[model samples]
Target chain A: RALRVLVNMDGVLADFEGGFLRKFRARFPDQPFIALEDRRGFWVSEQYGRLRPGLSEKAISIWESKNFFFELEPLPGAVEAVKEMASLQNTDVFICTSPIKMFKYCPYEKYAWVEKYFGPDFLEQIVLTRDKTVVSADLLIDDRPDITGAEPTPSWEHVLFTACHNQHLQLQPPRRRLHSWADDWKAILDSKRP
Target chain B: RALRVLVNMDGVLADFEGGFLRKFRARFPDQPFIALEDRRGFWVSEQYGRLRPGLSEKAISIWESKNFFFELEPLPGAVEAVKEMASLQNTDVFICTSPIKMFKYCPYEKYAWVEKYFGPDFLEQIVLTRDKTVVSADLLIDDRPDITGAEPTPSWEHVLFTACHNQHLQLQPPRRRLHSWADDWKAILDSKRP
Candidate 1:
C-alpha cells in the first residue's frame, strides 16, 4: 500500500513565526511582542489583538509585506525531513499550503521560496488552495489543529505538527502529533502507512 | 447530500482557445494558424509543431507570454453557469486549475482573473494544483479527457466539458459530458446529486 502525505507549508515547513517576529520587532521596537513559547491558537495576531488591540495590524503588515514570504527561513529539520519523506519507498509527498486571502504576492513568493530551498524539481510537489479538506491524502502534517473546509470529512488524517499556536489543541478522537521534524515522524508515518 | 463540483479553469471556464488565437494571430499575421474549429489535441502548439517544425515555438510564445492568462476572456455562458452552479442547493463549487510548469505569473494571474470576473468573494473558491487526482470532489468538469496523475483511483467522476481539442476522446466506463454551459448541466448534475 502507498502513502500520500500532504505537508503544510507555513508553520510546518517555513518558520513563519520567526519571519513575522523578526519584521514585527524591527518595525515596532517599543511595542509589545508575543514570545514564541507564549503563543496560542491558529492566528498569531488575534492573540496579540486581545492584549494590544492595534498590534495585530502592525504584525499583519510584516507578514503581508513584499519580500516577506520569499525571505522566510525554513523551519529546522524540515527541509531534510521532507526530502527524506519523499525518498521513502511507495510514499508520495506534496507541500499543501493555503494562500493569504487578500495578498496575491504570497503565491509567487511561495514558488520562489520552494525554488530556492527545495529546488525547481520540487515545484511540481506544490498544492495551493484555501480548503485543505477538498484535497485527498493519507495524512496531512500541519500545525493548525482545526482543518475544516468545504469537505466536512477529509480523506487525510490530521497529524498535528506541534507549534506554539496549535499546541493546546486535542480533537474528540485524538489525532497523531509530530512535535518536530526530528521527532519520531518516520516511525509515526510508518505505522499509518496503508 | 451535498454535491462538490470541481470546475477546471483554462479551456473550460477561461476561453484559453479564443484568447490564445487572438494573441497568436495578432503576433504572427503571416504565419499559418489553426482555427478554433480545426484545433485538436491538448497542446495547440504540438499540432502546429508537426505541420511546421518551428511553428510550435512561435505559437508557444503567444500563450506563455506575460499577461496571456490574465487577459483570457471567459468562455461563453461559463460565468453565468458557474454562478448558477454555486447558487444550486447543497452544491459546493471550486475552480480547480493546473498552471503551466514554467509560469510563475499564472498563479496570481489566475486569482486576478477570478477577481476581475467573479468578484473577490469567489477568490476563496479557487484551488490551484498540478495533480487533479489528489483532490476529492464528487464531479470534476474538465475539458481534458486524459486526467491521469499520481493517484490511480480519483474521487471525482470527470464530466468532460466539450472543446475542439478534446472532441475526439471518450472514457471507458463512459464518464459524463457537458457540451455547453447552456446545455442540461443543471439537470445532469441533478441526476448525479448524492
Candidate 2:
C-alpha cells in the first residue's frame, strides 16, 4: 500500500519566515531587525520588539494582514523534494495547510499561493484546516511545535520540518525531525517501508 | 483529548436530496421520477428517467450546475445537533464535505452553504476535500459508501449517515450505520469514553 504523506505549506514547503523577514525589511528598512536565529518558540512576536519598541505589535498586525500568506516563495529544494516524493510509487502526497483564524482572505490567499507554485494538479490534494491532528496520513511533514498537541494519539507519525522557530523543540515518540529537503528525500528514498 | 467528530454536510446536515428532488420537479414536471425509497445504491441518477430515456443525463447536468449545492435547506435537527456538538467540551466537530468534481462552483457553493447555515464559527472548521479518508477524525458521519476505499488502514471509524441512496449498503467492520441524527446524538452522548 502507498504511504499517505501529508505535507504542510507554511515553513515546510513555502518560505513563510523568509517571506515575512523580506517583507519586513522592505517595509521598514531603518527598523531594528530580529533575526530568525533569535526565534525560540512558535509565536515569535516578542522578538519583533527586540529590534524596535513597537515592532512586535506591528509584526503581529502584518501577520494578520490579508495578503501575508498569499505571496511567499517556495523553500529551497522544497519543490524538487515534494515532486520526487509524489513520483515515488508507494506514496500519496497532499499539501495540508492551515489558514489564519483572524483573516478572511488568508484561506483564499493560501489556495492562491498553492495554485501559483504547484499549479492545478495539487488543487484537489490541498487540505485547508487549522487542526493538523484531524488529518490522517502515514507521515506528516510539518514545522509547527504545538500541531500535534498534548495528546500522543495520532495515526500518522509527525515529521518536524526543520525551521528556526521549531528548532528548539525536541523530537517526541512517533515524531522525527527533518533537517532539510535533501535529507528528507534521501531518507524516504532509502527506506522501503514507512 | 477531545473526540474528533467529522460531520458531513450534504445529506447528513444539508438537505441535498430534498433540494435536488424539489429542483427536479420544477424543471421536469412530466418526467417520471424515482422516489428516494426505491434508491438501491449511492447514485440515484439512473432513476431520473426510469420511465423515460435521456432524463439521467439531464439530472446529472442539473446536479453539476453552478447553483446546485449553494442553495439547499438544512436537515431537521442538523443545525441544533452540529451546534451542540461543537459546543461540547470533549468533541471537536468539523464539517467535512466534498465538492462536485465536474463543477468549478461546487466548492465555492459548499463553502457558501456552510457559512450561510452554520455561520462564521464553522468557517475554519469547514474542510472541503474530495478524499474523506485524508481526514483524521475518530468518528466520521457521512452518507457516501466508497469513502474509505480498498485499504482499511484508517485511524478513524466510518459511521454511515443514513440517506435514501445509501440505506441498502450493509455496514462493514469498523463502519456503523446511523439511522437518524437522534440516534447519532444518542450514540455519541452514551459513549462516555472515546
Candidate 3:
C-alpha cells in the first residue's frame, strides 16, 4: 500500500504571504507593512499590524475576492517538489488545505488555483476544510501551528512547513519543521517505512 | 482546449437511489416501499411514500453518515462512462455534486468514494456544495431540475440526468433529459461545438 501523504496549499505549495502582501499593497498603498517577525495568528488584521480600525476588514474583503487565491504564484520549487513527491512509487499524495470560514467563494477559487498550476493530477486530491485534523492521513505537511485540538493527539504526524509567521511554534519529536521543498521530499519519504 | 463538462454524483454517477432503497429496506423491513412511479422531488421520504411521521429525519441521518456516501456502488455503466468522458481530449470533466447540509463528515466520505473507485483522476474534480449552479462550467449534467433559480439562467447549460424522484420537474427548452449513460456521451458531445 502507498503511504498517504497530505500536503497543504497556502504556505506549503502556493506563496500565500507573497500574494497577500501584493494585494494588501495595492489595496492600501499608504499603509506600511509590519515585519513578518512581528506577525501573529492567521488573521489579516493581526499580521499587517499598521492597519487603522476597520482597515483589516477592507483588506479581508479583497482577500476574499476571486483574485487572491486564483492569482497566487506557486512557492519556489514547491510545484516540482509536489509533482516529484506524488510520483514516488509508494506514496499517495493529497492536497489537504483549510478554507477561509466567511468566504463562500474561497473553496472554488482554491480549486481553480490548484488546476491552473498543477493541472489534473492533484485535482481530486484537494481537501478544503476548516478542521484539518478530521482528515485521516499517514502524514500532514502544513504551515499552521494550531491544526488540531484532539484530546489525545492524532495518529498522523504533523510536519510544520516553515513560514515566517509559524517559525515560533514548537512541534514534538517525529514532527519537525520542514524548511525547504527540495530537501523535504527525502525527509518525508524517509519518515515513513517503505 | 477541453470543454468543461460538470457531472453530478448521487443521481448521475453513484447509485444513490439504489443504495438508499437498500438501506431503507434494512432500516424499516416492516414498511412496504412506495413505487418509484409515485415519487416526487428529491427527498427519500417522498420516494418511499410510506414512512411513519418523523421517519424521514431518521432516514436522513443514515444517509448523511460516512458509510452511506462511502459505501455506495457506482450506477451501471456510470463509472465506465465517466472514465471515457474524462479520457476524451475535448472534455474536462468535474464531479459537481452537493453535500449533506447538516452532516460535517459528508464531504470527506464523498471524496473517499471518488478516490476508491475512480482513483486520482476525479478526486480533484469533485465539488461539494449545496448551490451547484454557482459552479462555472460549459455544461452541467445533474438529475435535479431546480438547479438554476439565480435570476438569469446560468451560463452553463443544465442537462437532466433521469431519476424517479425528479421526473415531475419541467426543465426549460434547450435543456433535455439524459436517459442512459450508454447513449448520453454522443448527446453531450453533439450539444457542444466541434
| lDDT score of residue B179 within candidate 3 | 75
All candidates' lDDT scores? Answer: 0.88, 0.75, 0.70
In the range B1-194, model 1's lDDT, one tens digit per residue, is 58999999998999998888889989999988899888989888899998797898988888678899999988889999999889988999999998786656888899999999899999898998999999988889999888988899998888999998987676566677899887888887787775
Q: Where does candidate 2 stray beyond 4 Å?
A: A25-33, A44-46, A49-67, A167-175, A188-194, B19-71, B100-124, B149-151, B167-176, B182-184, B188-194
- lDDT digits (tens) for residues A122-188 of candidate 2: 6777887767767777678888866753135766777788999878777667657788886755575
Root-mean-square deviation per candidate: 1.5, 4.4, 19.6
Find the candidate with the highest TM-score and give its number.
1
Docking class of 2: acceptable
| DockQ of each candidate, alpha-carbon based | 0.74, 0.36, 0.03
lDDT for each residue of candidate 2 in B1-194, tens digit (9 for 90 to 100): 77777899898998888888878888878876777787666665766656568987878877787688878888878988888888877777889886554635665577677778878668778876767877766778888876763136655677788998887777767667778877757575446345
Cα lDDT tens digits, model 3, A1-194, are 45767789888998887788778778778877655666666665655434566667766776777667778889889888888878878776778666664434565567677777788545656756444544455678888876753213444688888887777766676567788686556666676755
Query: When only chain A is evaluated, what TM-score does every model earn?
Result: 0.95, 0.85, 0.88
Question: Which docking category, incorrect, acceptable, medium or high, applies to candidate 3?
Answer: incorrect
Worst 10 residues of 3 chain B by lDDT: B146-155
- Best candidate (score: lDDT): 1
Residue-by-residue lDDT tens digits, candidate 1, A97-180: 998875568988998898888888898889999999998988899999888888888889889999978777676766778999
